[PDB]
Amino acid sequence: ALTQPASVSGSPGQSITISCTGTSSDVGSYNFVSWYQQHPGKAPKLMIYEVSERPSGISNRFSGSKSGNTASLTISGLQAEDEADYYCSSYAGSTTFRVFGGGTKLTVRGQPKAAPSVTLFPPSSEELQANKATLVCLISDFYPGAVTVAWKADSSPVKAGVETTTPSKQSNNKYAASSYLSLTPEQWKSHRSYSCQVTHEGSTVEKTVAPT
């Protein structure tokens, strides 16, 4: 029930402000606004409580305030590590008790573009004996988040049997994705090799694996 902008962005060393609008039932009437930082794959971390107070350990770059029905989180001296989703919440009376905002994605501009590290594994002997073959292409530490992967049997494009994840942000603010190719053991042994080829901003990284 609290309204926050979907997205804010700034460059390093800049200041940004995230707004959190409620009503007199919650934000307007109480000093019970708290703000949370959440990195992808992690629990939320309290940055601010009782509108303006900072838990021990929180950078004094973070500050909070409130005017009428709107509370504000300020980050000054922006650092790449501040990239994260931020959430406000408020006490909301004896009945509703507590409300969250819908979250704000903060992006910090000027992050180095980074090429994917690619690791390609062949099928294990154990899997081959079990009458299957999975080629595993692991793609990491790339930014920005968009890649397209294409598989090749020898030099020929393979479409069938491919499952590829959507990239999703890692700890470091860089992305990871996986792509899986399913083959019969017979296909695996009747090519010279297979390749996983990752395109990331005009530029291709390719890895190749061969039977034993």
Place this chain on the structure above:
Amino acid sequence: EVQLVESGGGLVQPGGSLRLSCAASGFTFSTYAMSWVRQAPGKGLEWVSSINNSGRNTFSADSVKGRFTISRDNSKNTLFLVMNSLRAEDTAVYYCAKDLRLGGGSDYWGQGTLVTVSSASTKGPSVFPLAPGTAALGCLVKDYFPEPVTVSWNSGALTSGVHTFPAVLQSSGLYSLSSVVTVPSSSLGTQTYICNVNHKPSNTKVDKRVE
């Protein structure tokens, strides 16, 4: 360190019941109000319920009223969420958190436990070794439902260089993931590397040597 160890999540049919536990230590659990907050995959935080320090007063979101019941055992430092009548829309990661004060901010959060409300039945994964200055070796954890699966290496002894990847969701409705670890090339064929795979919903516990 302050710890909020969650359990009791996993797979449940629509209409079914679970009980989440959150075991606290390294603070005086009986002094503080506690909350459960949930987060559906790719979505925002939603407050579920809170309970005052004595456990005598409790508060619950309208979305959950009459279905979930928060409670605590101060003696055993544990916070519970009894969840009855579960629906698909309750699928979410559930966090417990210690609140600085009742109705105020939450200053320590547990790591979350995934609750999957689905009619699909559990399936345990197959596990396969991934082998080839620096080198990468891994384990392939294939065809399981629901999430999550946990992977450690050498029983938690190896942590540096470990990257467990987000799982793919196949057309079939089954998940697969890989965990990889980068090591010095010189380590191969001297050090022993073993992935420990756990898929709690199927009680699958697997150790694979990787050569």
